[PDB]
């Protein structure tokens, strides 16, 4: 689940909303490369590992 520790606000309400959902469409709300010109978008952590 949440690999980084923290509190998920209104988790059970999110489950109750997602119970009656037939489909989803995953779309890019903010592009990573172009919508942040003056910040560093590269961020990794050891609490969430992928392929060692």
């Amino acid at each position: 689940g949440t690999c980084f520790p923290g509190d998920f606000a209104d988790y059970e309400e999110l489950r109750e909303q997602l119970s009656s959902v037939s489909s989803f469409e995953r779309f890019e709300i903010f592009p990573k490369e172009r919508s942040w010109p003056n910040h560093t978008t590269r961020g990794v952590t050891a609490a969430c590992p992928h392929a060692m």
């Binding site: 209104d10 059970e12 309400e13 109750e16 909303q17």
Partner: protein, 52 residues
């Protein structure tokens, strides 16, 4: 953000109505048959009394 309470209230309201509807229909369909059998029994008692 109180969807669970709304669904609980709907569950209570839709669960009582089914029980009361079922009880009313059972009461009517049993008392009708009891009334008809009672009438047939009364006619049979008059016939037996006149014969005796």
């Amino acid at each position: 953000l109180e969807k669970r309470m709304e669904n609980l209230n709907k569950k209570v309201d839709d669960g009582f109505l089914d029980i009361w509807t079922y009880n009313a229909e059972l009461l009517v369909l049993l008392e009708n048959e009891r009334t008809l059998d009672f009438h047939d029994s009364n006619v049979k008692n008059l016939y037996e009394k006149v014969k005796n």
